[PDB]
Symmetry: C3
Amino acid sequence: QPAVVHLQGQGSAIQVKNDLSGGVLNDWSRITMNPKVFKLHPRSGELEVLVDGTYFIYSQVEVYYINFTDFASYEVVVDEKPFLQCTRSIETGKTNYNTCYTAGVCLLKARQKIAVKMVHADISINMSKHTTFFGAIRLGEAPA
Amino acid sequence: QPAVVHLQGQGSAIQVKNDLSGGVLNDWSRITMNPKVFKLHPRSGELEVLVDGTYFIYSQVEVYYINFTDFASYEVVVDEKPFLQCTRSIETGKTNYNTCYTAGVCLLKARQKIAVKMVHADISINMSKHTTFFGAIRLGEAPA
Amino acid sequence: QPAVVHLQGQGSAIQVKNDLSGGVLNDWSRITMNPKVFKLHPRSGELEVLVDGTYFIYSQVEVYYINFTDFASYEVVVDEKPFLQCTRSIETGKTNYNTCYTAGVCLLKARQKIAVKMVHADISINMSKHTTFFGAIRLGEAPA
């Protein structure tokens, strides 16, 4: 029954201000991704669901440097509307590796799109397949 | 089959010492809440389960200021007894936004009550819609 | 009929370099564990899945002290191969209580073994019941 996706970070570091259009993480390896339910659009990094349902959504992003903000943040967005937000305060002036995890449950319709959108700042991300990832579980049907 | 709830903050900044009673968070907005399985008590901030089951419980609290103690903390308590505990270090004297997430699975009986309880410290929290939340998934029936 | 396990930390403080073999946490307390899906090997600290299936795995580790290196990290490993990694950067000098949570979904074959592996460093962990725990949900069957 339950279909899943666990997207892993791939490629080198992402320097958010230069390397992301509007902050959407967009280099995802699709190891496990059940295609009956989940479609990754690689260019945009948007994770589309192909079926109505109850979905548990989760993400983790590893930040390793902040230039002059003391604040790394990202939103888990659904059709561009914020659903979850993760914030961490990290001192600048030194390498400070921190994984930033959030998660939660919602109802989705078919063709809705989830993304992990960084808040635009002078931030550096480590795109290691183990510290940065983005996943979901179709738990079952949505009520009605 | 699985039934779910996701409660979100709805108000401004809460000063844990002066704005809550015994640390319990209570201004929850029901975005989604299956009424056959979950009941919110808006006054006590308790989330009641109406049927036995295997429950995944999660919570995220955005702490943005601390004073006279460098240790922000909360417990996810079941019938006043701690189940999960989240702790984080944040610098005093300046506003540092930090979301503090935890989650875990347990078996519950009907009428048991879940709540998020801040540590008694001079803590300020941002009860924002996206950064402070409280939720639960009835995965299914509980063993025996 | 969902099968779950939630392991809790049992003893007092733990010094990583001195108290563990290759960083693996093994003082786990079994509360609710399905003894047809999960088997705890208390000695190695491995949680073995006895059946194929789709598993959501989670973990939380309370770090409080780090010496000489400013870096606390741990991996959730499957068959000694990394799956999830969780990092938090704290000041090397002093006490700083921090829960370090990560989680994600995967597909597992019967007899595969999960464990929490700390990085080899002078890290102090608080193995407290409510701040340090290790869990798994068999969501259902695996594809195939």
